[PDB]
Design a protein around this ligand. Structure first.
Ligand code: HEM
Length: 140
C-alpha cells in the first residue's frame, strides 16, 4: 500500500526534520524515550548499547545508527531493487535477536507520537503507516 503518492510524501516529510547534529540527536532520543516509556519491557533487548541509560554516548550512537538506517530505506522507497538490498541487510541485523514482531507496531506508534513536533499539523499518518509497514516487513 506504499505507492508513489505515499512514498513521495514520506520522503519530503522525513527530510522536513531529518537534520544533522544536535537536532538529529534530540529526535532519536525522544523517539526511544517514548518507546521505552510505552513498553519498558523492550529495554532488555538493548543491553549491548546501554539501553538503561539513553544519555550514554553508547546509546546515543545506537540511536543515530537507527535514524541513518531509517534515512537509507525511506530514500529507497521508489527504487525496488535497491530497497530490497538494504532491508535484507537490516533483516540480517535483527534476525537472531528474538525480537517479538509486535514491537515494530509499537516503534511505529512512538514515531507517530513524536513526528508532530517537527511536522506540526501536516503529518500524514496514513502515508507514514503504509510505508513504515513496507520497511518493517522487509526487516522481519
Ligand atoms: C524501521 C524500524 C527500524 C530500523 C530502521 C532499525 C535500524 C537499526 C539499525 C541501523 C541498527 C544498527 C545495526 C548495526 O549497525 O549493528 C539496529 C540495531 C538494533 N535494533 Fe533496530 N531498527 C528498527 C526497529 C527495531 C525494533 C522495533 C526493535 C526492537 C523492538 C529493534 C531492535 C534492535 C536491536 C536489539 C539492535 C542491536 C542493538 C545492539 O547493537 O546490541 N529495532 N536497528
Amino acid at each position: 500500500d506504499c505507492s508513489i503518492l505515499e512514498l513521495l510524501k514520506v520522503k519530503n516529510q522525513w527530510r522536513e526534520a531529518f537534520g544533522e547534529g544536535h537536532h538529529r540527536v534530540q529526535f532519536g532520543l525522544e523517539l526511544w524515550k517514548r518507546f521505552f516509556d510505552t513498553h519498558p519491557e523492550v529495554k532488555g533487548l538493548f543491553k549491548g548499547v546501554n539501553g538503561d541509560n539513553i544519555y550514554s554516548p553508547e546509546f546515543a550512537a545506537h540511536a543515530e545508527r537507527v535514524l541513518s538506517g531509517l534515512d537509507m530505506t525511506i530514500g529507497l522507497l521508489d527504487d525496488t531493487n535497491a530497497f530490497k538490498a538494504q532491508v535484507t541487510h537490516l533483516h540480517s541485523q535483527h534476525v537472531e535477536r528474538s525480537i517479538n514482531p509486535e514491537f515494530y507496531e509499537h516503534f511505529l506508534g512512538a514515531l507517530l507520537h513524536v513526528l508532530p513536533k517537527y511536522l506540526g499539523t501536516k503529518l500524514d499518518q496514513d502515508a507514514w503507516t503504509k510505508c513504515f509497514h513496507t520497511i518493517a516487513d522487509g526487516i522481519k
